[PDB]
Chain length 112, copies 6
């Protein structure tokens, strides 16, 4: 029952693939426990997912940060052309998730 924070950035959002991102985390077995879109820069989509090992799990679904090293099968592998146009972020530890979760989301918005 850890939790992690994922966000889909503007270009990602202009391309139309938070659906994709959500589908992959759903498919992998994680519960979506919060989500919202935020307006400006560029709009972004913030999410929080919960599951056994979801922080390491989530980073693996996303693929390597550097899209030039990201393998097919991951989000960055399948979708992202350049590190700027990577357009996705996930927490890198259980510690940083909590900072990101608690910064971006009112607790009323999360789901226990």
């Amino acid at each position: 029952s850890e939790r992690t924070f994922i966000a889909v950035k503007p270009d990602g959002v202009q391309r139309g693939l938070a659906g994709e991102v959500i589908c992959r985390f759903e498919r992998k077995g994680y519960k979506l426990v919060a989500l919202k879109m935020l307006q400006p820069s560029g709009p972004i989509v913030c999410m929080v997912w919960e599951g056994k090992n979801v922080v390491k799990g989530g980073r693996m679904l996303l693929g390597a940060t550097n899209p030039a090293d990201s393998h097919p099968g991951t989000i960055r592998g399948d979708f992202a052309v350049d590190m700027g146009r990577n357009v996705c972020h996930g927490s890198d530890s259980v510690e940083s998730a909590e900072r990101e979760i608690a910064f971006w989301f009112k607790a009323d918005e999360l789901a226990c």
Copy 2:
């Protein structure tokens, strides 16, 4: 540039298919202009989509309200077992969208 309101209801959400719903509206060409998840009953996901003819458009993606009449290819066709366990709602007119958009979303949350 009309707009419509779509929502994915609890069981829908327990099954894991707002990704699916979002992917179909993305794929169809509509801009997602707001979205958030709301906690209790059961949690729900509210969205607003914008495009030429999106209110009639959106209802067609969803399929007939009565899942016993919903054809494959639509969300209710592909996913929903019973009218209770239909678990999806879309505005039925441009008029009702505005009531639903303006009830469920602060305008800061929408995107002009």
Copy 3:
């Protein structure tokens, strides 16, 4: 909790799409309660699915018997070229399911 019988016929099986068939019934919410493949003519795959309204449900996933009338979104719509090369069968009533279930499957094989 009705049940129905579905079968994927030889050409269907030479084309490689019992996966597809199973995925659509899974996606729709039905429990797979038996399944096996049978060898000769041509091999075939027999299945039994269970759910609210699954007999009418299942026929709708399959699409119209006459592939010339089958719409996209259904199995026959998406996959089948001719009525011979339709290659799929589903029960047409709750009555005929039981004859088909109980003929093709030992009860040890079904799952209560």
Copy 4:
């Protein structure tokens, strides 16, 4: 072994979905017997497909010409926002296919 002519028009091509179109005709069982892209207006992708009943078959995969009437599961259902932004064409008869095939393709390009 009829044949038909399909073409994916500029916006279609700017959106990135001749893959989709080709995948659906492949999936349905038709042989692709010619194909090429043509540059200007806007670029377009011309194809020829062959199979039992492929002219009526192909129009059905595409869905109704008027995207406001096109059901989900078809290309126009799933992808096209307006009749201008429909962006796809298929032959309406065995007669018109031959005019379209023989106009757009050198016979060296087709495949017997």
Copy 5:
């Protein structure tokens, strides 16, 4: 023309993804030469696939045994949360396949 044994375990089966598994092996080019579901613990789905190099092939489709090391694109990558909740098994050699094939399947059930 080697053969291998694959099985989808209970939780896998409660989640609804033998379709997925079958689709990936079909897509990869392997012939499905036997298959059946078995009832209790938890029900399971046994399969046998045949093709050039299918034993090493099949393990690669499944991904690393330890779901914490399984990359996206594989079954365990895309679907499995924990090593218990990995829920899939494939033969590790041509030798062990034969033990698994011949244990789990009557030869009448296989297809030469």
Copy 6:
């Protein structure tokens, strides 16, 4: 704005997966700037794609040349059984692309 040359070879083409190939390059963000099919040996489909880093990009979508080493998520991973029956080719450098582009395509056919 580099460019690369991709080609789908006969068996690939008999299996029906230039759609797949095109869909993956589209999905990854590359512009398709030329494409055509060529008749005999076996027919083949030639394409040219353009984007930031598309030559290395394209080889990564295809996966390792030796299908016995190709991971799931790539084309060769997901689809190809043997190195002969690999059936796909992509340029290995910006230099070799230009030789392949300029050999296989009249410049009228490319798109600036």
